Amino acid sequence: GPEEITADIPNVGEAALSKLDESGIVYIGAEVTGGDILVGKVTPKDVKDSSLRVPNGVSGTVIDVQVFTRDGVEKDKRA
Amino acid sequence: GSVTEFLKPRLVDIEQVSSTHAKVTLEPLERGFGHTLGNALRRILLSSMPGCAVTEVEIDGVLHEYSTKEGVQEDILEILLNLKGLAVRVQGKDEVILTLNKSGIGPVTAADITHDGDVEIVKPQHVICHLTDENASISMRIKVQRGRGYVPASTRIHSEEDERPIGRLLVDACYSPVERIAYNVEAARVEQRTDLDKLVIEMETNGTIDPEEAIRRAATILAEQLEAFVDLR
Amino acid sequence: GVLKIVKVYLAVKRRIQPGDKMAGRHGNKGVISKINPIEDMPYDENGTPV
């Protein structure tokens, strides 16, 4: 099946999704560190974790988020 | 008056060349104490002078430092850098929140800060940003704390207990109010000793510290540090 | 095969620290060895440190 970008993530705490919005994408201007969730994505196996995470030893501030959607696929709120 | 008893130096003149440049004269000194005292005071003043500095900023529409505001002529990072150079004097407490609200075309100087009574702006003409369009307004909440030395943003954020919301910008704090020190030892005339010296300390600050108070604080720090050697177990 | 792409840009500030490589325009490269305190650096008659 098709994987999707969603807010919730299995087997994680609530503090992990604090930076993520309702669309599963980290807030612009949110300070992040190594291991933090950036884009919440899961893949059906019910689902397995495939979300993008900040590489270890990498920090900074999110300053830009770009969303590219194929024609026909619905666009989320951030797009 | 003898070999065993030393002449105690004391302050004799405070020449305020400008609001920042100042001269402090100490005399008399006994054949080499001038150089030692001047070097010790210069080393203490350049590193252990308490002062007030801007720590956190919060603009109305700005959400991170790498963005821009509609109307301002400079970047948000530039605004933070200019705010870093703001010199204020705080009496009563070590924590103050100031509010700035400006509108219309023109510079936004430190004189636009809302009057607080216990906070004095040494440089009221210090510019911050430039509003280049009508109907464009800037609203800022500046956070100022008292401290010592240079504390970067990472050192303060290492606690991470506050977890500041998006839009609260951290700026490196240079709490030191003394920017330049130069000591000079020359001959001093005291009745008939003919071998005493006077020490003149020229200090350039940001205007938020009294030169006499700075000298007194440096002497107090030196005495407090040296009392341990005085005791010596 | 792909139906969506999301790119996130992270901006960080790198400050000078020992081990960083600095050079002039005449090939005089080197690495920072120590960040000396302001009061420890040599100063002239006017009191301005280098």
Query: What b/e string do you get for A32-70 counting C-beta neighbours within 10 Å, with b at 16 or more?
Result: beeebbbbbbbeeeebeeebbebeeeeeebbbebebeee
Structure token pair of residue A63: 């300053």
Q: Which H or E run includes C31?
A: strand C29-31
By Cβ distance, the residue of B47, B66, B183 closest to C39 is B47
Structure token pair of residue B191: 């009745």
In chain B, what residues touch C45 (CB-CB under 8 Å)? 182
Distance from CA of C39 to the nearest CA of B (A): 6
d(CA B143, CA B220): 29
By Cβ distance, the residue of B43, B66, B182 closest to C46 is B182
d(CA B49, CA B206): 12
**Residue in the block written with tokens 């503090």:** A15
Over the Cα atoms of chain A, what is R_g?
A: 13
Domain spanning B3-50+176-233: CATH superfamily: RNA polymerase, RBP11-like subunit (3.30.1360.10)
Structure token pair of residue B227: 């009392």
Domain ranges of chain B: 3-50+176-233, 51-175
> ∠ CA B163-B148-C49 to the nearest 5 degrees?
120
DSSP state of B7: P
Interface contact B85, partner A, CB < 8 A: no
In chain C, what residues touch B202 (CB-CB under 8 Å)? 47
Q: Which H or E run includes C11?
A: strand C4-11
In Å, how far from its chain's centre is CA C30? 12
d(CA C35, CA C50): 13
B166 and A27 in contact by Cβ < 8 A? yes
C47 and B47 in contact by Cβ < 8 A? no
Contact at 8 Å (CB) between B199 and B38?
Answer: yes
Structure token pair of residue B124: 């009221």
Of B155, B199, B209, B200, the residue nearest B45 (C-alpha): B209
DSSP state of B220: H
Q: Which distant-in-sequence residues (6+ apart) come within 8 Å of B201 by Cβ?
A: B23, B24, B26, B38, B41, B42, B181, B182, B183, B184, B215
Contact at 8 Å (CB) between B179 and B206?
Answer: yes
Q: Which H or E run includes B156?
A: helix B153-157
Q: Determine the 3-state secondary structure of B67 from DSSP.
A: coil
Sequence positions preceding breaks in chain B, C–N over 2.5 Å? none
Q: Which distant-in-sequence residues (6+ apart) come within 8 Å of B67 by Cβ?
A: A29, A63, B76
d(CA B157, CA B107): 32
d(CA B44, CA C39): 8
Instruction: For residue B64, count other CB atoms closer than 10 A to its CB.
Output: 20
Q: Where are the alpha helices (DSSP H) in C1-50?
A: none
DSSP state of C38: T
CB-based burial label for B131 (10 Å; 0-12, 13-18, 19+): buried
DSSP state of A61: E
Size of interface A-B (CB pairs under 8 A): 17
Q: In what order do the strands lie in the sheet with B168-170?
A: B95-103, B137-147, B51-59, B168-170
Distance from CA of A71 to the nearest CA of B (A): 31
Task: Report the residue of chain C nearest B39, measured CA to CA.
Answer: C39
Contact at 8 Å (CB) between B201 and B27?
Answer: no
d(CA A49, CA A26): 16
B3-50+176-233 against B51-175: fold identical: no
Domain spanning B51-175: which CATH class is it, in words? mainly beta
**Residue in the block written with tokens 């100022």:** B144
Interface contact A63, partner B, CB < 8 A: yes
d(CA B22, CA B1): 32
> What's the first-to-final CA gap in chain B, in angstroms?
32
Residue B72 sits at φ, ψ, to 5 deg, of -75, 145
In Å, how far from its chain's centre is CA B51? 4
